[PDB]
């Protein structure tokens, strides 16, 4: 993600979800987002397989006693 790609994304994503951003606000949002993107990139280095599951999986109801 280059800085120019981040700026286009922040603008389009904010409009899509309904958060109105003036230009100074969009730049401040992109500054934080850029730091987070480096964190996410590090997370992508961890080898996960398709069967590496979510930490919590749905429980539809307690299993009954007997």
């Amino acid at each position: 993600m280059t800085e120019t790609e981040i700026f286009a994304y922040i603008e389009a994503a904010s409009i899509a979800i309904g958060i109105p951003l003036e230009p100074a606000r969009a730049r401040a949002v992109a500054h934080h987002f850029s730091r987070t993107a480096l964190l996410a990139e590090m997370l992508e280095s961890v080898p996960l397989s398709p069967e590496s599951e979510l930490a919590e999986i749905y429980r539809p109801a307690p299993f009954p006693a007997e």
């Binding site: 749905y58 429980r59 539809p60 299993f63």
Partner: protein, 457 residues
């Protein structure tokens, strides 16, 4: 002949297990060029398994409950020594599985004989088993029509008489849809009942595994064989075995049985409505019941499915998007692009939904709905019409299934044959509360006994 008679024939010495195996192999050889249900035939394994059952019988042993019964599995199940395809070409180069899926191991321990791996929509995303890489699976009742999906091979193999039992998966409908469209029996157990270990996943939060079969007894026997905790499986919540076979014939006296309305009527065509009506009459259900927030339940399932399934394949979407199934790759990509707010909202809604569904089942034992809005459309269908509303065919097949699996309630899909419908079948969902699979199965058995639910063989 059905599961029960096959098992009896081997137990009693009327037929050898090896002869039963060779008959299934010859049927596959003769029919599968057209049906295209199988992607791999485990011939050497099948013959050695059948041989081993005949050795045990000849020694005078008591045989296990599925001894000699042929079966096949959707090709997302790991089969030792075989590369798990999950309907993809991407997986072809992965190492062969080191072990059978746990459910395969349990069927093997019960004496069942594995004949091989079955066709599916790539990576389980689809309801029609129109696979671009492997070819479509064709409905044995009319080979110009779809078998349904994503477990289409699992349904077709049973309706073509190739095997009496198969395994499939169901996230948003993929056992129930082919059961409906092929006219065979299916069981989607409670979410977290049956171990998912050694299977290729789609949606960690929603995937279920279960049997399809030639009879309701087939479902119950296979389900009992497969049950049990698996501490190595993150999704499993069942802490003990709750056998269904001993009570299968107990009947439905005193149960509160209702018919779902609203969403489940509005999205049901005339044949689907007639199937529910006749099943309701047979089961003594007359009250119309509203399922809580059904359309929103579908919506939330849809959102979670697309993001979790798409993101699972993100690394491959980045480097080899052209190697995916062209009919679903854009749906996977859409899923990856979904705002994280939609995912979180769906997960928060799911708590509310679980509470409302569990509350609904404090007043009801079984609820009835159709399995699919219509019977099998033609292969290559882009759009269907349901009570005057147009839908894309591929997503639309799961309109009635998707709200129910999201709550994780168990369902038997019972095959029925409504009158005004070109001789094609349509299934009925018999839905019970979490952990109450044996109620669904009891209701199925009543439909089977009266002749309302059946195969056409």
């Amino acid at each position: 002949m059905k599961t029960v008679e096959i098992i009896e024939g081997i137990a009693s010495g009327r037929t050898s297990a090896r002869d039963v195996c060779e008959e299934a192999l010859a049927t596959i050889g003769a029919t599968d060029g057209l049906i295209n249900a199988f992607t791999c035939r485990t011939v050497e394994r099948a013959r050695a398994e059948a041989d081993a059952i005949d050795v045990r019988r000849a020694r005078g042993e008591v045989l296990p409950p599925l001894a000699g019964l042929p079966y096949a599995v959707k090709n997302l199940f790991d089969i030792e020594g075989v590369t798990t395809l999950a309907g993809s070409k991407i997986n072809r180069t992965l190492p062969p599985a080191r072990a059978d899926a746990v459910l395969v191991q349990r069927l093997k321990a019960a004496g069942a004989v594995l004949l091989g791996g079955l066709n599916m929509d790539e990576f389980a995303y689809g309801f029609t088993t129109e696979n671009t890489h492997y070819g479509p699976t064709r409905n044995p009742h009319d080979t110009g029509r779809i078998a349904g999906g994503s477990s289409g091979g699992s349904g077709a193999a049973i309706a073509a008489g190739q095997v009496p039992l198969s395994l499939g998966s169901d996230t948003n409908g993929s056992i129930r849809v082919p059961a409906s469209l092929c006219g065979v029996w299916g069981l989607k157990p409670t979410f977290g009942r049956l171990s998912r270990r050694g299977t290729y996943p789609f949606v960690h939060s929603i995937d279920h595994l279960g049997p399809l079969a030639d009879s309701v007894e087939g479902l119950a026997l296979a389900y009992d064989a497969m049950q049990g905790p698996d501490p190595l499986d993150p999704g499993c919540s069942a802490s003990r075995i709750q056998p269904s076979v001993p009570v299968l014939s107990q009947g439905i006296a005193g149960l509160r049985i209702g018919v779902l309305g609203g969403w489940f009527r509005d999205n049901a065509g005339p044949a689907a409505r007639a199937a529910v009506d006749v099943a309701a009459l047979t089961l003594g259900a007359s009250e119309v019941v509203m399922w809580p927030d059904a359309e929103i339940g579908r919506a939330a399932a849809f959102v979670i499915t697309a993001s979790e399934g798409g993101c699972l394949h993100l690394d491959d979407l980045r480097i080899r998007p052209q190697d995916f199934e062209p009919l679903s790759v854009d749906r996977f990509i859409s899923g990856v692009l979904q705002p994280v707010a939609w995912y979180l909202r769906a997960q928060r809604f799911r708590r509310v939904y679980r509470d409302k569904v569990n509350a609904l089942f404090r007043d009801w034992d079984i609820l009835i709905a159709p399995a699919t809005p219509i019977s099998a459309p033609a292969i290559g269908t882009e759009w269907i019409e349901v009570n005057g509303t147009r839908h894309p065919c591929r997503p639309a097949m799961g309109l009635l299934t998707q709200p129910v699996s999201f709550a994780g309630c168990p369902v038997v899909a019972a095959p029925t044959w409504p009158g005004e419908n070109d001789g094609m079948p349509i299934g009925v969902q018999l839905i019970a509360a979490p952990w109450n699979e044996s109620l669904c199965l009891r209701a199925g058995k009543v439909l089977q006994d009266t002749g309302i639910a059946r195969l056409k063989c």
